[PDB]
Amino acid sequence: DIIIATKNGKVRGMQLTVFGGTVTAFLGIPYAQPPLGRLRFKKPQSLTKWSDIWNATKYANSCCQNIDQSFPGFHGSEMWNPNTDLSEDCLYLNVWIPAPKPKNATVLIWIYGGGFQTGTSSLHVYDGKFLARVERVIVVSMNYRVGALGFLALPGNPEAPGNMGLFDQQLALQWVQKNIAAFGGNPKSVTLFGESAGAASVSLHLLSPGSHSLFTRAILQSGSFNAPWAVTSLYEARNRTLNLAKLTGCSRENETEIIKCLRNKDPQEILLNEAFVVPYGTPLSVNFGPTVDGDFLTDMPDILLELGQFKKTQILVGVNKDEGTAFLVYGAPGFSKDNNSIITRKEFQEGLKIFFPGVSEFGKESILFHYTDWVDDQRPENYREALGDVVGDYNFICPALEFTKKFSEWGNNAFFYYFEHRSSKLPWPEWMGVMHGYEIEFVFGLPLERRDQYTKAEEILSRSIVKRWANFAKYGNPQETQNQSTSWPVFKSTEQKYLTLNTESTRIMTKLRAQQCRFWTSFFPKV
Amino acid sequence: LKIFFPGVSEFGKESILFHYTDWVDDQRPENYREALGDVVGDYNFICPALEFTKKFSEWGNNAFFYYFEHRSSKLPWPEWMGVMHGYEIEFVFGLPLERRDQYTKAEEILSRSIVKRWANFAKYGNPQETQNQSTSWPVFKSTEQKYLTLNTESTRIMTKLRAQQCRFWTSFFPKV
Amino acid sequence: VQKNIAAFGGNPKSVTLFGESAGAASVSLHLLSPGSHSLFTRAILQSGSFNAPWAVTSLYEARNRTLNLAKLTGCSRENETEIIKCLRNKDPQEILLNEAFVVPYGTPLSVNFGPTVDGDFLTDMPDILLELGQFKKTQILVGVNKDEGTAFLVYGAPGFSKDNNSIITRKEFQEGLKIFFPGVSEFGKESILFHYTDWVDDQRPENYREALGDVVGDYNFICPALEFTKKFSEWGNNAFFYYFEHRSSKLPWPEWMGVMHGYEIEFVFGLPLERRDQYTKAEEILSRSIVKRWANFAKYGNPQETQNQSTSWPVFKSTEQKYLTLNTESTRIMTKLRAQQCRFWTSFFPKV
Ligand SMILES: *[C@@H]1O[C@H](CO[C@@H]2O[C@@H](C)[C@@H](O)[C@@H](O)[C@@H]2O)[C@@H](O[C@@H]2O[C@H](CO)[C@@H](O[C@H]3O[C@H](CO)[C@@H](O)[C@H](O[C@H]4O[C@H](CO)[C@@H](O)[C@H](O)[C@@H]4O)[C@@H]3O)[C@H](O)[C@H]2NC(C)=O)[C@H](O)[C@H]1NC(C)=O
Ligand SMILES: *[C@@H]1O[C@H](CO[C@@H]2O[C@@H](C)[C@@H](O)[C@@H](O)[C@@H]2O)[C@@H](O[C@@H]2O[C@H](CO)[C@@H](O)[C@H](O)[C@H]2NC(C)=O)[C@H](O)[C@H]1NC(C)=O
Ligand SMILES: *[C@@H]1O[C@H](CO[C@@H]2O[C@@H](C)[C@@H](O)[C@@H](O)[C@@H]2O)[C@@H](O[C@@H]2O[C@H](CO)[C@@H](O)[C@H](O)[C@H]2NC(C)=O)[C@H](O)[C@H]1NC(C)=O
Ligand SMILES: *[C@@H]1O[C@H](CO[C@@H]2O[C@@H](C)[C@@H](O)[C@@H](O)[C@@H]2O)[C@@H](O[C@@H]2O[C@H](CO)[C@@H](O)[C@H](O)[C@H]2NC(C)=O)[C@H](O)[C@H]1NC(C)=O
Ligand SMILES: *[C@@H]1O[C@H](CO[C@@H]2O[C@@H](C)[C@@H](O)[C@@H](O)[C@@H]2O)[C@@H](O[C@@H]2O[C@H](CO)[C@@H](O)[C@H](O)[C@H]2NC(C)=O)[C@H](O)[C@H]1NC(C)=O
Ligand SMILES: CC(=O)N[C@H]1[C@H]([C@H](O)[C@H](O)CO)O[C@@](O[C@@H]2[C@@H](O)[C@H](O)O[C@H](CO)[C@@H]2O)(C(=O)O)C[C@@H]1O
Ligand SMILES: *[C@@H]1O[C@H](CO[C@@H]2O[C@@H](C)[C@@H](O)[C@@H](O)[C@@H]2O)[C@@H](O)[C@H](O)[C@H]1NC(C)=O
Ligand SMILES: *[C@@H]1O[C@H](CO[C@@H]2O[C@@H](C)[C@@H](O)[C@@H](O)[C@@H]2O)[C@@H](O)[C@H](O)[C@H]1NC(C)=O
Ligand SMILES: *[C@@H]1O[C@H](CO)[C@@H](O)[C@H](O)[C@H]1NC(C)=O
Ligand SMILES: *[C@@H]1O[C@H](CO)[C@@H](O)[C@H](O)[C@H]1NC(C)=O
Ligand SMILES: *[C@@H]1O[C@H](CO)[C@@H](O)[C@H](O)[C@H]1NC(C)=O
Ligand SMILES: *[C@@H]1O[C@H](CO)[C@@H](O)[C@H](O)[C@H]1NC(C)=O
Ligand SMILES: *[C@@H]1O[C@H](CO)[C@@H](O)[C@H](O)[C@H]1NC(C)=O
Ligand SMILES: [Br-]
Ligand SMILES: [Br-]
Ligand SMILES: [Br-]
Ligand SMILES: [Cl-]
Ligand SMILES: [Cl-]
Ligand SMILES: [Cl-]
Ligand SMILES: [Cl-]
Ligand SMILES: [Cl-]
Ligand SMILES: [Cl-]
Ligand SMILES: [Cl-]
Ligand SMILES: [Cl-]
Ligand SMILES: [Cl-]
Ligand SMILES: [Cl-]
Ligand SMILES: [Cl-]
């Protein structure tokens, strides 16, 4: 029986057997007042003392959210859906620590993604026990509020100021600063890591003065705040808060009374209407996301990035080879996960209208022009592949590269990767390639479990990624120093070197997607 | 090894085996097949060509290095033999420009680009394709050792071809 | 020392660690250990460093050896703590008597029980900490003696004796490799033989004798000390490297063993300054100069002798790799000590 005294109370954990060793897990420690009733839509409030022993032996509730129902019964989608009850009472975190208890272990804090509308830290692919066992780091992960309940904004109004889910994250970071030493952790060696909206989050913590003393270093997997989906404009946010009000019968004029009315609706009514606050939007649109609130975010983040107003530290950033393909089977005509989705020119153009809805005809023609000058006129998969690259370059790759360039220009070491291994177990079809989300299981070391159907080469790849991530967290340098590995060079805005991650040959390459990103980053923002 | 290195000591041959058989997976059936081909190709062609180019460029002259990795669609040898010795020649001489002759469209484009780069090298000392938004071919210098890959898909600038293998053949192996 | 040396007239902010062989390896681990960082200023490493092959016991070696010691003393249990409690009731002599046998193949000099990655003093494998710059940023002075390996040869290598000139044959050489590299493959040992036996003259009788000593000294001391110094200087700090090549006039070991492991120490501690004690005048001058350079290093971070028209000691940088030779005749600046040998031990041999 292992009991740790925290600043707010005792917590009891449980022992896990991992690779013939032991890991101690504390699942579901509360870190804030449950944001219920009058606390709905507000910043998270500090948690007051308890005097008994809190049993942290099961994952806690996941935050309320609309789940993915486009592929019922299919593991490729359902692996991302919440696996604990949904509840507004969801502000909990998880701690995995090595056994025996470490003396001053580096701490990895995971922030899940899911478009700021979904996600939970209890997913199988985020299980921190392998990292704790294999690299003797402490892994922490938190639930934070998503969708309108986490990001509804009336800027300036503390009844619904925006960015609440980011403040949830920030309060979990504070909890680690105050408490992880009792667990054997070093609060001066904390690395944030996250994927998709979790990476965008990590990048906003680099920008937020309130987060600067709460962590050391940062890892951004397939996301950054400058991605086009990651920050909601204050005009978008007001229109959407107001549309949600009308849709729920809560239109008022004392702005605070819209909020009080929204506070009496059941979670289900709020969730049901979230999808429709945007005139044109898909199962994946970021209806309620981060905003410039004047608190967490003091200015438009593109300005802060460009002018060097961010935490000066090392970053590790990267993207997967086929980021865009996942999005195509949620609406683009002609696409299906159950066939090879050979689409025509007309379907391609229709697909652009779905992914770029309020873009001019000329804007969409310019995309088509830049992605359809083929090397062979007659390859049937031309348009299929182009649409996926369009979506992936615009939404993930070019923003991640621009973030890394702009961040490194202020003097800090940055390391960039390109993950191009397709999991042997991937349940999605081969045409979707190296999908968004599917590096995570390598980062968390799932292929280290030989019982679990991965190949030997995937075991070696995950082992190497785990070591590089751990070395980055501990030492600020993502090398594998012992096994004659390719050395990972720093990314500099001139040479733009990056490391490819695959089972065969790991290589140093330069200027990823050079011609594509000049289109998205330089020209396209004008249209 | 005994056939390809006949008057080499037992230790010499063991050292080749040591440097080419530390597998990424113990159990891939083609491990030894692929290793023997790489042994023969690195010793006899690739490492000497790279060493020549380094030593020649060290005296001040522009050098350009390529790595040809396209397997001809018409190749009559089996797939396991890959991008064989001799089989870039037909691209250099422009045979795939003859549409009547069973090559793919991508091979026509590749041969056309190689022919232009060779011709530009002969005429101007610089193997660029300047008109069709092509990857620029950097000079090979003994420090950075940049080279151009030639294939139908994506033509890329890479660095330090066969670095670990050639340190074996060029630095150690001549001692045995 | 931090808490008490001021009462003795000492400056706790000017503390230099120095040590030799396992003591130098220790000094180098204090550079790596966060708990030691505020306890000293500067460091001197004489014939050792933690990256030497004998200096850090693997956690797998260490468990096997703790368990073998348990069986050998009748303390095998399964509550791990109860092995220890049982070991705590044995007499010191019983523990000591069984230490030698915890390793299947080992000599009077093997490091049966050494430093380990304990997660406390040592938070990670030290080679990783060195390579990634995780160590105390300060000046170091590092060096080695010309014949580090010879001492080990008379503790087991066949054909060797301190009481004759130990001319050994090829077969004895190969046998000697098996003693010094016991769990190394046949190919590994052949590769050592290949790199150390391409003679300048086929027929010099002492060829194999000299080669075996250089094998042992380069692998165990010189190449690790040079690699430590390169890797440490790459993070910005001044490092100074020496090569001690004076054979003590009083040395009781035979001349063929040369400038042995351990035999710079008496010069460092100034024993030849005692004229009553049978050293030559040149050895008095050499010890006096070494003592001044060591003291200047401790006090000022710079091992010069500034007053007597001495060779200036350059910093060691990973590009030029300059080092200072220490001898009674002529003290010289040289470059890239053991270049070809160390490329073998440091780059190739760890693969075998
Ligand atoms: C938080 O966890 C603790 C401990 O959790 C356990 O610890 C590990 C080591 C394993 O043993 C796992 O089983 C658990 O994870 C919880 O403490 C348990 O509380 C129960 C109460 O339900 C206790 O069990 C029984 O013990 C007493 C011994 O005297 C019995 O007498 C009790 O039965 C009585 O119930 C009647 C109620 O009026 C009473 O009048 C009768 O006379 C009857 O005898 C009791 O059921 C025991 O203290 C713990 N259980 C175990 C297996 O150790 C703690 O409850 C958890 N906190 C929660 C759930 O909020
Ligand atoms: C800002 O919101 C208005 C209103 O949105 C409508 O009402 C909401 C409650 C919700 O159900 C939305 O889906 C509705 O669209 C948007 O105005 C609508 O725009 C569409 C197409 O442009 C049009 O067909 C509707 O008739 C409009 N409805 C009204 C009431 O004007 C408006 O487009 C939003 N602004 C932006 C920039 O998207
Ligand atoms: C691939 O499938 C899409 C999706 O169609 C659905 O899923 C299929 C696997 C099958 O079960 C169909 O019955 C389903 O309707 C096909 O897209 C449809 O294409 C035709 C015309 O092209 C028509 O039925 C619909 O308009 C399309 N439906 C959607 C949702 O786009 C597509 O044609 C298939 N492509 C190939 C190459 O087989
Ligand atoms: C790990 O230890 C085993 C056991 O060591 C033996 O028992 C000890 C108490 C001690 O007396 C040692 O000297 C013994 O050797 C090693 O296994 C032995 O290996 C040798 C040669 O390889 C063999 O002849 C013995 O029969 C083995 N004995 C047993 C009990 O298995 C083993 O080699 C050690 N591991 C390593 C990597 O050295
Ligand atoms: C040098 O001496 C070694 C050691 O032999 C012992 O010490 C000698 C000084 C002398 O007192 C001997 O009687 C001792 O046995 C000699 O090594 C021996 O060599 C012969 C065969 O070569 C044989 O007696 C033993 O196998 C060896 N013993 C050992 C312990 O190695 C060596 O031959 C002498 N070399 C020279 C050049 O004189
Ligand atoms: C509130 C929620 O989402 N989940 C609860 C959980 C469920 O409500 C319950 O399992 C029915 O679905 O109930 C938890 O608490 C239980 C107590 O009500 C009771 O003492 O019986 C159980 C004893 O084992 C248990 O403690 C749970 O099962 O953990 C609490 C959880 O938040
Ligand atoms: C734990 O370690 C602390 C020092 O942390 C160091 O600095 C930060 C920035 C990281 O880079 C980390 O890896 C370093 O070790 C000490 O100040 C503290 O006293 C230590 N505490 C315990 C209990 O060991
Ligand atoms: C002793 O000297 C102290 C200063 O030490 C200085 O700094 C360290 C880092 C060394 O380089 C040392 O040689 C320097 O002199 C003073 O702070 C202290 O007050 C002094 N105390 C007495 C009693 O003189
Ligand atoms: C109405 O608006 C005023 C002014 O902002 C505010 O003080 C008040 O709390 C709001 N609600 C009510 C019920 O008065
Ligand atoms: C390095 O290789 C060893 C086997 O030689 C393996 O056990 C270990 O997991 C590897 N380490 C990393 C970090 O890949
Ligand atoms: C360049 O492209 C044109 C068509 O746009 C083609 O006809 C020509 O052969 C190409 N030239 C080279 C050198 O590849
Ligand atoms: C036996 O093992 C337990 C568990 O580690 C430990 O608490 C105990 O002190 C050990 N010894 C005895 C005598 O119980
Ligand atoms: C320098 O030379 C003088 C004599 O000229 C001698 O007494 C002194 O010991 C020497 N000092 C050093 C540091 O060698
Ligand atoms: Br948006
Ligand atoms: Br070799
Ligand atoms: Br050892
Ligand atoms: Cl690609
Ligand atoms: Cl077309
Ligand atoms: Cl590219
Ligand atoms: Cl452009
Ligand atoms: Cl094999
Ligand atoms: Cl290569
Ligand atoms: Cl080599
Ligand atoms: Cl010498
Ligand atoms: Cl000989
Ligand atoms: Cl030398
Ligand atoms: Cl060599």
Residue numbers in the entry:
A (entry chain A): 3 to 529
B (entry chain A): 354 to 529
C (entry chain A): 178 to 529
Give passages from the manuscript.
Based on these observations, enzymes involved in neurotransmitters breakdown (e.g., cholinesterases (ChEs); monoamine oxidases (MAOs)) are among the main biological targets for the development of new therapeutics. We then evaluated the compounds’ inhibition profile and binding mode towards cholinesterases (acetylcholinesterase (AChE, EC 3.1.1.7) and butyrylcholinesterase (BChE, EC 3.1.1.8)) and MAOs (MAO-A and MAO-B, EC 1.4.3.4), as well as their antioxidant and redox properties. To gain insight into the binding mode of TPP+ conjugates to hAChE and hBChE, attempts to solve the crystallographic structures of the complexes formed between compounds 2–5 and recombinant hChEs were conducted. Compounds 2–5 bind similarly to hAChE and compounds 3 and 5 bind similarly to hBChE, although distinct binding modes of compounds to hAChE and hBChE were observed.
Compound 3 appears to bind hBChE in an opposite way than hAChE: the electron density map of compound 3 clearly indicates the location of the TPP+ moiety at the bottom of hBChE active site (bottom right). The wider opening and overall volume of hBChE active site (500 Å3), compared to hAChE (300 Å3), allows the TPP+ moiety to enter the gorge and bind in the vicinity of the catalytic site. A π-stacking interaction between Trp82 and two phenyl groups of the TPP+ moiety may stabilize the molecule inside the active site. It is important to note that, in previous studies of our research group, both the fitting orientation of TPP+ compounds within the active site gorge of hBChE and their interactions with Trp82 were predicted in docking simulations. Missing electron density of compound 3 indicates that the piperoyl moiety is not visible. This moiety may be freely spanning outside the active site of hBChE. In addition, as usually seen in the X-ray structures of this enzyme, an unidentified 5-carbon long carboxylic acid is bound in the vicinity of the catalytic serine extending its alkyl chain in the acyl-binding pocket. Thus, the data obtained from the resolved crystal complex of compound 3 with hBChE is highly relevant for two main reasons. First, this is the first time the binding mode of TPP+ conjugates with hBChE is experimentally demonstrated; second, the data constitutes per se a validation of our molecular docking data obtained in previous studies. For instance, eqBChE and hBChE present different volume of the active site and exhibit three specific residue variations in the gorge site (Val305, Asp311 and Leu313 in eqBChE are replaced with Ala277, Gly283 and Pro285 in hBChE, respectively).
